[PDB]
């Protein structure tokens, strides 16, 4: 009833942060426009009205940029976050935006390729896979991720509960009141559960699943970390984005 | 936190 209105709550703040939902995503991968399909050098030439793996990583990075504001939108309509002290809500942010980012991600995905620019191309596993020495592992974890995860079959409604549990984790390092953390993400924890068990009742076993997957992207994300870190070896003067290094300055 | 410009601008102003 409290916890429905924090469902209910959740998912509309969800749709004003997200512009491309799992929903609006999934009903351009079925088969009904169309995107342009990007699964070789030839095909991103024909398709670039809509170096290339620093190109291309320009974009993951411009694209994750967009997406720390949305969740940072995001978070702050989840009751009680606003009133935490400020240097937890930063805490928060810089800890679990590259978890959310990850679920995300496997919204846009499937086993053979994921939606960019906003729906209207389609760049395949294969054609990433395909890129040159460090930048051809990049995708490929988070393709392994979404297989794993979207067979969950969780929605935008499951998803919005989901991304509030990831961000309210009271175990974030330099955090300074963890009681106040815990006690929102039990409430949020409890609305996941019933959702789940409401949106999926045929589907025993799916918050258990969710919760070893949200255990799993601790893992998922120093792996994906230890990877940018071989690029900043390897490619000199380039960079990160202002706001990507000011995230992963001193982790 | 000072150390988190951006950060702290998103979550006190929004983004621009
Ligand atoms: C939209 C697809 C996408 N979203 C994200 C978010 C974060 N990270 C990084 C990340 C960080 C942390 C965890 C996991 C992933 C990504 O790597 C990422 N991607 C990739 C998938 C392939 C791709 C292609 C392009 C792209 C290339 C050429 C032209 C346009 C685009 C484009 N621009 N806007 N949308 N597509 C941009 C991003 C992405």
Redesign the pocket.
């Known amino acids: 009833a409290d916890l429905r209105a924090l469902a209910k709550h959740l998912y509309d703040s969800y749709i004003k942060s997200f512009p491309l939902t799992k929903a609006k995503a999934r009903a351009i991968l079925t088969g009904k426009k169309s995107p342009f399909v990007i699964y070789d050098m030839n095909s991103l030439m024909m398709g670039e009205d809509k170096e290339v793996a620093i190109?291309?990583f320009q974009?993951?990075?411009?694209?994750?940029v967009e997406?720390v504001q949305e969740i940072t939108e995001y978070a702050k309509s989840i009751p009680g976050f606003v009133n935490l002290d400020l240097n937890d809500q930063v805490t928060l942010l810089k800890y679990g935006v590259?978890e959310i980012?990850?679920t995300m991600?496997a919204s846009?995905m499937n086993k053979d390729g994921?939606?960019?620019?906003?729906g209207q191309?389609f760049?395949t596993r294969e054609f990433?896979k395909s890129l040159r020495k460090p930048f051809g592992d990049?995708?490929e974890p988070?393709f392994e991720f979404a297989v794993k995860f979207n067979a969950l079959e969780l929605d935008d409604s499951d998803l919005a509960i989901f991304i509030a549990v990831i961000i309210l984790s009271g175990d974030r390092p330099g955090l300074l009141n963890v009681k106040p953390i815990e006690d929102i993400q039990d409430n949020l924890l409890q609305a996941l559960e019933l959702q789940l068990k409401l949106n999926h009742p045929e589907s025993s076993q799916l918050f258990a699943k969710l919760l070893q997957k949200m255990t799993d992207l601790r893992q998922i994300?120093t792996e994906?970390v230890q990877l940018l870190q071989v690029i900043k070896k390897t490619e000199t003067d380039m960079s990160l984005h202002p706001l990507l290094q000011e995230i992963y300055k001193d982790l | 936190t000072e150390r988190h410009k951006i950060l702290h601008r998103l979550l006190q102003e929004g983004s621009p």
Do not use: D, N
Not at chain 1, 59 to 64: E, L, M, N, V
Not at chain 1, 114 to 118: F, K, T
């Open positions: 190109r291309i974009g993951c990075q411009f694209r994750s997406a590259h980012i990850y991600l846009l994921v939606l960019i620019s906003e191309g760049m990433l990049f995708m988070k994300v994906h």
